[PDB]
Design an enzyme around this catalytic site. Structure first.
Site, mmCIF file in Angstrom:
data_model
loop_
_atom_site.group_PDB
_atom_site.id
_atom_site.type_symbol
_atom_site.label_atom_id
_atom_site.label_comp_id
_atom_site.label_asym_id
_atom_site.label_seq_id
_atom_site.Cartn_x
_atom_site.Cartn_y
_atom_site.Cartn_z
ATOM 1 N N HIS A 26 0.806 -1.213 0.000
ATOM 2 C CA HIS A 26 0.000 0.000 0.000
ATOM 3 C C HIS A 26 0.843 1.269 0.000
ATOM 4 O O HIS A 26 0.282 2.367 0.078
ATOM 5 C CB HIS A 26 -0.964 0.001 1.190
ATOM 6 C CG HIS A 26 -0.294 0.066 2.527
ATOM 7 N ND1 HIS A 26 0.235 1.231 3.040
ATOM 8 C CD2 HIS A 26 -0.088 -0.886 3.468
ATOM 9 C CE1 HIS A 26 0.751 0.990 4.232
ATOM 10 N NE2 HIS A 26 0.566 -0.286 4.517
ATOM 11 N N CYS A 28 4.870 1.669 9.608
ATOM 12 C CA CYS A 28 4.470 0.581 8.725
ATOM 13 C C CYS A 28 5.694 -0.064 8.089
ATOM 14 O O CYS A 28 6.654 0.616 7.716
ATOM 15 C CB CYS A 28 3.525 1.091 7.637
ATOM 16 S SG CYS A 28 1.782 1.149 8.109
ATOM 17 N N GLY A 67 4.038 6.280 10.722
ATOM 18 C CA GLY A 67 5.295 6.055 10.040
ATOM 19 C C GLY A 67 6.026 4.785 10.412
ATOM 20 O O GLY A 67 7.192 4.628 10.031
#
Lengths: 299, 300
Positions: free
Chosen positions: A39, A143, A141
């Site tokens: 993503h 991920c 932040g």
């Protein structure tokens, strides 16, 4: 007794920052491949109903910015494996460790290296909950942060952070892009199932208490599997299987307390409560210590 | 919800850990530049532990009596000197993995990460706090003596603790990196008693302030109290007294939120007398006293 996390040295050198457009997250740099959530190629608008196939064909090699500290990595190709993104880079990682990709089951423990924008910040130990979620501390932040286990010289990567469920728990996949639990990488209303206590881990923790000399909860009674399970279902405790008994066998021989014998102790703890006492200094029964963790800690 | 106890990455410290062997004794060492730091009781047998004469024991040792191993590579000891309760072994090779490092002495209530190692090999890392009785809570079996405690700030590592002894109640004692012991303990195998352990009050208040920021407010009351009134009640629960210094440290926390520090103290007083009643604060069923005000402010 403390929840120890594996040393993170071999994993710190594989963390990179991946930027695509206005979105930046963390990436795992092994050999000449960078792994990150798929993503990263989606804007905020596209998160509603993304079609990852059409968005990936439009994207080119120069739309991805991969940074390893101060150096810049050049992407020479992109590939998609389920929900993970594979970016081929020009330079191989000289800090690549001996590693293997594995998928774990709920109730198993692992260590997590939480990184912000490619920079490691913290490490902690956790367990995969029965509802396929993890209770962690991931702010914005983080991920692409990875979970791992270490077997001497071999690092087993088993988790990568993908989403942030509104309940506080987090959802992710393995390194092959297969999700843990019934979740999709979409910005929609998703709910984690009912969280339940891992019974086998509590018993291993209770065995560790007897090793530490704390044995006030031991009684003369013993129960059976079916009778204990009906009690376990009442207070939301995971059913106990025959395989759990054999796994806890080594702890049974050392302390001399049979698995079904110790089961009656846990049954009394759930029924009559703690009676204003403590086990290893805790008023609550920990369920994030696997039987293998207990043996490693002391024996 | 969720405020997990996170430990600093241990990569910069793992390359500094070595194994020190003297006679039949073996423990962990810290290899910074061309110096190896390790507890001075490595020159002791089990018999010498009762009444060790360290000056007499060290004068009889030569350089070749110390064996230092970094992985499969062995280091050559070219000199040695004693500084308080720590031994400094000079080696021919400077450590190429030496990071930016400092030595700092810590006060009770502050937190650091501990890297537990056995025979020079790191095994696990955890986060802890220095208890008001100058002890630490952890699981360090034998052979883990010499493990260091550290904080990491930007790229600089601050070493603050070295494990030395195991008190018989289950707590552990150690020194700073200059060899000065924390609390009233000595490197002797004699009857050493740790004082009563008290809850770090200032850490609980900072944790509760972070609870208000995240939306948890069920424990607030409209009452206020004075510093002396709260302190008198606090002693009854084995809580550390709150000083005027702690009030100003929590000032930024009490500035972002609308609750005065003494207002927050009244709520903590009511929690102690009542309990949680099955509720949780930031996903915790118990009051947490291992998060410093500095950590809460930085993490907001």
């Amino acid at each position: 007794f403390r929840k120890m996390a594996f040393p993170s040295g071999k994993v710190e050198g594989c963390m990179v920052q991946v930027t695509c457009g206005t979105t930046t997250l963390n990436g795992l740099w092994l050999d000449d491949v960078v792994y990150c959530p798929r993503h990263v190629i989606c804007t905020s608008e596209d998160m509603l109903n993304p079609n990852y196939e059409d968005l990936l064909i439009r994207k080119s090699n120069h739309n991805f910015l991969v940074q390893a500290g101060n150096v810049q990595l050049r992407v020479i190709g992109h590939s998609m494996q389920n929900c993970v993104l594979k970016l081929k880079v020009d330079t191989a990682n000289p800090k690549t460790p001996k590693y293997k990709f594995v998928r774990i089951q709920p109730g198993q423990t692992f260590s997590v290296l939480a990184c912000y924008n490619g920079s490691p910040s913290g490490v902690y130990q956790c367990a995969m909950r029965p509802n396929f979620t993890i209770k962690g501390s991931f702010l914005n932040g983080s991920c692409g942060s990875v979970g791992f286990n270490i077997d001497y010289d071999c690092v087993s990567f088993c988790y990568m952070h993908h989403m942030e469920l509104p309940t506080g728990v987090h959802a992710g996949t393995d390194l092959e892009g297969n999700f843990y639990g019934p979740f999709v990488d979409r910005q929609t209303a998703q709910a984690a199932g009912t969280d339940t206590t891992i019974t086998v881990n509590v018993l291993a923790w209770l065995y560790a208490a007897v090793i530490n000399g704390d044995r006030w909860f031991l009684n003369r009674f013993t129960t059976t599997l079916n009778d204990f399970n009906l009690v376990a279902m009442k207070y939301n405790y995971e059913p106990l299987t025959q395989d759990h008994v054999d796994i806890l066998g080594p702890l049974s021989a050392q302390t001399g307390i049979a698995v079904l014998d110790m089961c009656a102790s846990l049954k009394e703890l759930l029924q009559n409560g703690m009676n204003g006492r403590t086990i290893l200094g805790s008023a609550l029964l920990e369920d994030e210590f696997t039987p293998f963790d207990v043996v490693r800690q002391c024996s």
